[PDB]
Structure 1
């Protein structure tokens, strides 16, 4: 634990959680590249609206933060070094599937 070393206010090592996962493919895309490699998104908090101009004014210190990884164990251990609450999720690689142009012409 390195909580004292980081200047981070207690609130945000406490009352919020990281949410490790390998990101899903954008489904509009047929691409696969961005899918791989663990990342460490935090939970969303409140974000209201600017009384003037209608801007999405926001309070939380660290909403936009996000971090890539090569391995999940490294990620969990990472947050543990930070003393972080976490929600590890499985890599969900698609099952391989059989394909056949001629099966379309059975009968």
Structure 2
């Protein structure tokens, strides 16, 4: 339930082939840009680092949890169906 991991913009590269070794069988790969994840404090800085390094990008806007009005007294409401049956 913590939110301390949703405060910095991340840059990541699309995944690629990941086969299994003929030996014991780890997850091999041939794409060096597989574990590269970069962190940026603002979208503009992040979107600027992409084409400056020359990388086609797509950007998804930050999802802000909308404020929700919560009242404890609603748990026991005279009329409204929000009255709970257990506590």
Query: Where on the TM-score scale, by shorter chain, does this alignment land: which range?
Result: 0.7 to 0.9
Aligned-pair CA distance for 1:62: 1.4
Output the TM-score relative to the length of structure 1.
0.70
Q: Distance in 2 between matches of 1:64 and 1:72?
A: 21
Q: Cα deviations across residues 44-80 of structure 1 (Å, max 9, x unaligned)?
A: 0000001110111111111000011111011111111
Q: Secondary structure at the match of 1:77?
A: helix
- Higher normalized strand content (fraction of residues): 2
**Poorly superposed stretches of 4+, deviation over 3 Å:** none
Question: Residue 35 of structure 1: CA displacement?
Answer: 1.1
Q: TM-score, normalised by structure 2?
A: 0.86
CA RMSD of superposed structures (Å): 0.7
Higher relative contact order (CA 8 A, sep 6+): 1
Q: Greater helix percent: which structure? A: 1
Unaligned runs of 5+ in 1: 1-29
